[model samples]
Target chain A: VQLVESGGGLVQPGGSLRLSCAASGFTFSSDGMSWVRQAPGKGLEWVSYISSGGATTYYADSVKGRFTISRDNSKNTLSLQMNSLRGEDTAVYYCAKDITAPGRNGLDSWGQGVVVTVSSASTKGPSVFPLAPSSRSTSESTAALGCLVKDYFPEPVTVSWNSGSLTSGVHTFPAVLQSSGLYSLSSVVTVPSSSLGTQTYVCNVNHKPSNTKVDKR
Target chain B: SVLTQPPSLSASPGASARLPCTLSSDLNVGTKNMYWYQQKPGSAPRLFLYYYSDSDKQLGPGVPNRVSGSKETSSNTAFLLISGLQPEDEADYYCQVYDNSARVFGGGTRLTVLGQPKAAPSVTLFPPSSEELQANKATLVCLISDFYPGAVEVAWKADGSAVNAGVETTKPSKQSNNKYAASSYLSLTSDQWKSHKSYSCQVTHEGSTVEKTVAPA
Candidate 1:
């Protein structure tokens, strides 16, 4: 019923990453084990799997040569080791229980996932480069506003409008790595057109250096 | 004083179960809010009801009206009544209370619904792997699967004598195929395991017993 991942953090390209998932509330060796990874905003991809008794193992072609999946039946833990990492490897990794049928594969249980950032540069604070607003269709009742957070190292940031006054109709896009080895994110919000001219919309950015606290998860 | 609950209960399908959680002698049942949760074997606990009074109660979304919460001030106890029971209703139920300070939970009650079809389990016992023995430790696995009604008891014996130390068993969990599965484990030092001539895992279900044994050789 619970899977806890033990290790995560920044790892440079060409380095190796290893982590373990401790399982409890059930028999660990009663089912097959699997590893899954997901890039931000992307669907999950299966990396590797091992049968219940370790008599059979399978790996995706993309990771076959560099990824190894293992289990310790005595310890109720499953492990993943990946070598020769790259920037494209920045993702959230999860260990799961592999439930399969004759011709189908399924993962019924999953860990909460650990974020692993593949970066070589040091940490840097980000900026709300510009709070841009646009009026779409003058007759429409709503206006579209965009907040762009740019040039952040280590890819973790948040943006809010009017000091958390806005709650709905907000969409944040995925992070994009720029050629300069920094990250950028864009968020859009829709607000009543009538409030655009009279109300002040403030864009709040919390990057590495800000240290402003919010509700912890 | 702490909250109190009976260890278990038994009922037939279509009957009703009235489970009570007694409050501490010093506490009044009317002044606090009560929460009720259900937990199946090998599954996460799910909160279903929050109650303060007859007029102030919230049931989780999708919860059926057959479940309700009530209070008995005469006995300083809160009760969860589940009516029209089915085989799927067999599970452990817990009650909780928090008064702006420490949260307390009652010892859970396991409800067993009878008159369902029964199927004996398949048992397999695996000896310690050579790799673990190399580390001077040994673990024996007893896998029980393909059972119905989800109630079984397991016991371990070594050299024809009861073995209680380092023995653990999991709750029977329903698999995707709708059958129940469980496992029991026995841990020992490699030297201690080799000293015994044989080890046995005995599973009892529906007035019958099945066993699997392994020898050191």
Candidate 2:
């Protein structure tokens, strides 16, 4: 079966592009398809996957919405629409066969990836930030420090626990999709009461090509 | 293709509760139909909210006003926030949608009241038994069985201290009798195994902890 792309290239920051992957070998209802990204010199990062019937599953804590996957079972083609592109979106895009065969960890068959680059001449916009609650109390003796991001970018954002030694506790960030088509990210690091005052918990937000911003309250 | 997100819930005794629901990425947020459920200790899961899209928010019977929900597309995560936790709140809370089929759960988090939580038991070894003698790799295996609600973590320790290298863990899967089981594997060489001989498996579930070790076998 052949996976055909609509053939579209580099969009300026804030512009959009529509790419389609048409499957020729299998019925769209019997198999699954996924879109992944391999950053320059980086490993594959799961963007999203769609079922034979067009169901989608997104990885946790992912940003980069302007991108979406859709399928037309009747036409045997899957489509990806990426909007509001930025330089950070430049990467090798791959459309792979999401063989949901029982007893597998991830996708099996993959298509020759297509690389897309975002340029400054594309539509440009200011980066939006999310507003998450400052502190969340899990128990009387425990609490978590967290931050939220709006209109998130998927790469260059790392969440970790940094209490002097950088491994004092566990930090987790959950990616939440909002109704406005934007994304929100909030990370929490659990700390015991004893370390609350002495230890400083931080949520560092890094926008590519920009310095990192620390959120500590 | 499943068009619904797995439901997840967490609560503390006499404290607030949070239920996070994920929707199929393909689902148009515009449709909005979602629901929530509360399953008390021994009773069937009961509905607590319905017609819960972006516009309609209805609270179920016996549900307190302390709970709320919001959706984010970038993260595709929905949040159900409940405040003022109580003993009666110690039940399995679930989030659901009308994408068809029965609602699924996101491995619900059990909330226990008072005292230490009882986690499952695990096992570990120093030198991982290896077919490759030259690799000198000692292997540690952590196993947790017969656990209900099925959420646990396993780690390895060398001598009296915890060894944080070559650790691999597995997610819980269904067993023959409908129970849950999981395991973790770690490898070290024969030389390192001999130097840090004593190995133990530390299993943590909720707030409870249990351990097992490998012997001369």
Candidate 3:
């Protein structure tokens, strides 16, 4: 099992963040994925589950928004994104394989757990960012690269790029939340420039949990 | 649908006894595939009859015609009547359903005869001597040469935490005096074993839980 750190972290409440759990050793398409939360002094709370066939079930009966679970079967990764974070989200989040039915004995196996925490912002605190595209520029041209987040929690903050130059063709896709409470969105833009060597591109993101931030490359 | 019913049978030693195998559902008249098993004292279970129906019947290689079945669609029940009750008949009996790849067994019923010894059987594992080791691989083996098996399950734990990987079991073999014996093996790689680790083997059978522990070796 491999849990990739998104290199992004959350500070304080209402901040945007995303992380992923990648698993191997079993067929992802035949198994189901579930997200669990363990608050500092409390037991685990089952957040939600997604079946291999794309069916989803949730345990939250009244509360809504800010949490989602999505999977990329091809990459064998289950992704989680939360928006408008709050101290309540300050818990260790884990992704695990859900056993559909107990055998003669019971559920017999589990994966190692991954821990994530929500904390207040400080120079040494966690970093928070929205789901956004990274940009690259060369003497010849500039390319826009981004990913789509889906299925597990709060909507992802969109990321895009803007250079000082008036290059055009930027498009923002609407973020969609499935009936199962997962968020998904896609974004792409092209920067046309004649100067090949020293051209620079700025990447921008729109998020719910935190103020929008931009990156230049 | 769930099936439930009490099965009853009686026979004198050296005389034929008919055992009633009952089911809670109407056996699919066209595709009734019920199975029966016998679990002798201190031995693993053995199949007695299978693929039985109201109109068609198939018995195991050595099963005698003294064992027969009858079904009542109105009550949704099936009966297995065994005619001859031998000394070996003083064992546990169970009925099962052949549901495709999944096999479901009914709660077993024990049969006792006059003058039969109700000796309880048991097994234990001795602890390892060392508490810390730097080897790349470690293994612990537990052996049980005496046991009256009805249903048994074995599992390992490390420091009170269940070990879900690197475990294997050997087939049960018959010992002298019609007794059965078996062993279980658990192994972990060097990087997997921790210093001062406390490992335990828990065996569950007939509603009883037996456990043994070992330190790192």
Candidate 4:
């Protein structure tokens, strides 16, 4: 059996959420479905459970009113909905097949959890700039060019270079969180030192939330 | 009814990989657009790009042109092509499609960039603790650590025979030292555990397989 989960991502506090889990290789209506959650680095919490036949349901006290669990047997899917989300609701949520009968009394199968972040970020985009030694000398065999992307929120930013010839040696690092709660990312590309002046190398940073983009040469 | 993908793929750095997504025969790829996502261990799945057609594609953030999508309508398949691969490009890529108002995601494909030096995992098998054994259950853990490239397959065996009933392995997580670590678990009833002479944890990394076994101790 296999399970695939999708549809939870960055959202502001008080926003609503709809996450879905799709199951295959078994009859969806013959097994109970459960929603489980875990906060970042925290233990797991059983949030809700609906029986196989969809006649009985149970929910933990933590999210009785704001969370709803439903299933579409036709599509072999379980859906999780949340209303009036808060920072405390930030978690990685999963759906599992609940087998509570004769031989087994726990979740038997699970979906890969999806992350949900319920926080607000500033409207600011990242600052994109070319690092030192951006200009290369002809005598050098090869040189490295770097782009620094700093102070972005929502943590989803991309750094790309304009020249395809330089892309073969590009390495973009994952975003790193700063103490101030923002994020910084960096990318570097190596190219022949003699090719620096023939074409401009522009670095572009696209911040996800606001679709804000900053480019620098 | 479902989207399908290969379990994994490997490519040398500086080469290209054509990752594939095939929809079930009942679904037609020509009528549907595809969305691609990339996920690494300990991180949320991030949007990589959205593809409807050559003219109607949208890349996430600052995604470079080297990462693009294509489709083969004759076979109901879509492809994510990444050119000029880098180590940082190694990740699990997923494809999603909307079918009859329900969204379905493919079992992700793990992309391994093969330029990194190969390192075998350090495997250690731990028997059940005293308390758990007293409770009539035995849980064996296999700790696999300090591996490079993060592409390792784990298997459990009982007396040299393969066992799959209660085996669970986690995705390899990157460590501070730039290596990777993962763990696998095997659950057995104390009675069943006592009946077996030995339980082995087998790890396969970069075409080399190693095993560590534990018996009643």
Interface RMSD of each: 23.6, 20.7, 22.5, 17.4
- Taking the tens digit of each residue's C-alpha lDDT, what string does model 3 give over A117-162? 4554332211222222222334366544333322223445655556
Error of 1 at A2 (Å): 3.9
Residue A82 CA displacement from its true place in model 1, Å: 1.3
Candidate 3: DockQ? 0.01
Q: Write the per-residue lDDT of candidate 4 for residues A115-207, one digit (tens) a residue.
A: 887666656587664543423333456666666565577668877788444467665655544323355556666677766668577887778
Local error of candidate 4 at B216, Å? Answer: 5.0
RMSD (Å) of each candidate, 1 decimal: 27.4, 21.4, 25.7, 18.8
The C-alpha lDDT values of all candidates are 0.71, 0.53, 0.51, 0.73
Query: What's model 1's lDDT at B59?
Result: 72
Model 1 chain B poorest ten-residue lDDT run = B96-105
Better of 1 and 2 by lDDT: 1
Candidate 4 lDDT for residue B95:
85
Q: What local lDDT score does residue B80 receive in model 2, on the 0 to 100 scale?
A: 65
Q: What TM-score, over all chains together, does every model reach?
A: 0.39, 0.33, 0.33, 0.48
Q: Write the per-residue lDDT of candidate 1 for residues B69-182, one digit (tens) a residue.
A: 899999999999889998888887877674333345677777888765667797656676555577687767666777876667789999999886776566566665677777
Tens-digit per-residue lDDT, B48-127, candidate 4: 77787887776765577889999999888999999999888888887876454344667778888986666778665666
Per model, how much of the real contact set is kept? 0.00, 0.00, 0.00, 0.00
Q: Where does candidate 1 clash, by residue pair? A: none
Worst 10 residues of 1 chain A by lDDT: A208-217
**Scored by Cα lDDT, where does model 1 land?**
0.71
- The per-model DockQ list reads 0.01, 0.02, 0.01, 0.02
Off by over 4 Å in 3: A1-217, B1-31, B35-62, B70-83, B87-118, B127-132, B149-152, B174-180, B195-197, B215-217
Model 1 ranges with Cα > 4 A deviation: A25-27, A99-108, A131-137, A140-147, A154-183, A186-217, B1-217
> What is the TM-score (0 to 1) of candidate 2?
0.33
